[PDB]
From a paper:
Strong evidence has implicated the lipid kinase PI4KIIIβ, a phosphatidylinositol kinase widely expressed in mammalian cells, in the replication of several RNA viruses, including HRV, due to its signalling pathway. As a result, PI4KIIIβ is an appealing target for prevention of HRV-driven exacerbations in respiratory diseases. Inspired by the renaissance of covalent inhibition as a mechanism to target proteins of interest, this strategy was chosen for the development of inhibitors of PI4KIIIβ with a prolonged duration of action. The aim of this project was to develop a selective irreversible covalent inhibitor of PI4KIIIβ which targeted the conserved lysine (Lys549) in the ATP binding site.
Pleasingly, compound 4 covalently modified recombinant PI4KIIIβ protein. The incubation of an excess of 4 with the enzyme revealed only one covalent modification, indicative of a selective target engagement. The mass shift after covalent labelling was consistent with addition of 4 minus the fluoride ion, correlating with attack of a nucleophilic residue onto the electrophilic sulfur atom and expelling a fluoride leaving group. To gain further evidence that compound 4 covalently labelled Lys549, protein X-ray crystallography was used to characterise the adduct. Electron density consistent with 4 forming a covalent bond with Lys549 was observed. The oxygen linker of the fluorosulfate group directed the warhead to interact with Lys549; it is possible that rotation about the fluorosulfate warhead was restricted due to a steric clash with the o-methoxy substituent. Compound 4 bound through a hinge binding interaction between the valine backbone amide and the nitrogen donor/acceptor atoms of the heterocyclic core. In addition, the p-pyridyl head group formed a favourable hydrogen bonding interaction with Tyr385. The measured KI was 29.8 nM which means the reversible interactions were favourable and a low concentration of 4 was required to achieve 50% inhibition. Despite this, the irreversible step, forming a covalent bond (described by kinact), was measured to be 1.17 × 10−4 s−1, which is orders of magnitude slower than literature precedent for a lipid kinase, thus, the rate of covalent bond formation was deemed to be slow.
Numbering used by the authors: 304 to 405, 515 to 801
């Protein structure tokens, strides 16, 4: 039978490492400790233990100790590890694999990292070898992240059911204690910040260079991916009221999708903004340009997807609300503030509106999301003065 004590000890071992990292002040010293800690871990591998974020049956065979990184200098600094596993068909009928004798991490292309680690590993030759990643957070409450994950998965199910081609990428969350857990990061994606820094290009010119020129299938495909993911995250950001959007917490993948990460401030999280914002989702000049501009066909597609996505969401509203209620009862998180949280969430599904009214609302919301475009300061004085322009 599959024993749970080995798994418990495995997970505990990852969390124990963090307490020892906390004894050191700088990220550099923490990283040095972490490498040594993971080296010890390999004494006990392979074993009948698994990474629950895998999503497929496997055994852990190795942790490439030199490849792990601590992410900051905080007392309970997150740390990122890579974990080698051997996939198996059926866990409970598979034997434990035999042991085989023996800044850049974030920017570096995933396929390059997989290549190097595979080359260095005694297990890298096996066809069922896979590389996983987790970020261990010993001092962060991840229950808000878990709630977001659950809601994001439900929206994907809803959009699939309603045949709306919105795209999002939920990332897996394990809640360990009330103030610790793990995350499976999104790989093969780079923050918008880093893409722009390394390339010194606008997003459009980056797309043109990386995917292809205007007349190419690759450009159009990438543009479509961008639009579908933009619309998906627009709706995520609105319905869950995700704050603190910037180019550090929006990632771009190799297919042209954007991916929002870090839902620290959702629903009734403090501080509530004072800027009369509908959402922290912003549509910048750069983003609109990737979509072919304000009069662009792909921008029109964006707006259509937003409408159809919202129609789909309200059609299945109870499936989302239930998730949030189940969490609110079981826990007591800072994203909740009494009974107004659920009321306000339901109100964002606009159940009283006709689809005609919803369409007008979407036009309004999209206009709002573009308010920080310089042109808006330039071209909206009719609302601020008795002039008609
Ligand atoms: Mg006026």
């Amino acid at each position: 039978p599959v024993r749970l004590a080995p798994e418990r000890e495995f997970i505990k071992s990852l969390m124990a490492i963090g307490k020892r990292l906390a004894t050191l002040p700088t990220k550099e010293q923490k990283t040095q400790r972490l490498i040594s800690e993971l080296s010890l871990l390999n004494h006990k591998l392979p074993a009948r233990v698994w990474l629950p974020t895998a999503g497929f049956d496997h055994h852990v065979v190795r942790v490439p100790h030199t490849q792990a990184v601590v992410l900051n200098s905080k007392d309970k600094a997150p740390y990122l590890i890579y974990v080698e596993v051997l996939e198996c068909e059926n866990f409970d009928t598979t034997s434990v694999p035999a042991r085989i004798p023996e800044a850049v991490a974030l920017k570096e292309p995933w396929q390059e990292k997989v290549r190097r680690i595979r080359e260095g590993s005694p297990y890298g030759h096996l066809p069922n070898w896979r590389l996983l990643s987790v970020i261990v957070k010993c001092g962060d409450d991840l229950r808000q992240e878990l709630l977001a994950f659950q809601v994001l998965k439900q929206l994907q199910s809803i959009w699939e059911q309603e045949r709306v081609p919105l795209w999002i990428k939920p990332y897996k969350i394990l809640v360990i204690s009330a103030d610790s857990g793990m995350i499976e990061p999104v790989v093969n994606a780079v923050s918008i910040h880093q893409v722009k820094k390394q390339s010194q290009l606008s997003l459009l010119d980056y797309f043109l260079q990386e995917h292809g020129s205007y007349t190419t299938e690759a450009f159009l495909s990438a543009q479509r991916n961008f639009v579908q993911s933009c619309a998906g995250y627009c709706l995520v950001c609105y319905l869950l009221q995700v704050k603190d959007r910037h180019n550090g917490n929006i990632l771009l993948d190799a297919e042209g999708h954007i991916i929002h990460i870090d839902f620290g401030f959702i629903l009734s999280s403090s501080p509530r903004n004072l800027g009369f914002e509908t959402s922290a989702f912003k549509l910048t000049t750069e983003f609109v340009d990737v979509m072919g501009g304000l009069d662009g066909d792909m921008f029109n597609y964006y707006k259509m997807l937003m409408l159809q996505g919202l129609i789909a969401a309200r059609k299945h509203m109870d499936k989302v609300v239930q998730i949030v209620e189940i969490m609110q009862q079981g826990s007591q998180l800072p994203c909740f503030h009494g009974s107004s949280t659920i009321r306000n969430l339901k109100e964002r599904f606009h159940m009283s509106m006709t689809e005609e009214q919803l369409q007008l609302l979407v036009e309004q919301m999209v206009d709002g999301s573009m308010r920080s475009i310089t042109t808006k300061l330039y071209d909206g004085f009719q609302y601020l003065t008795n002039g008609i322009m």
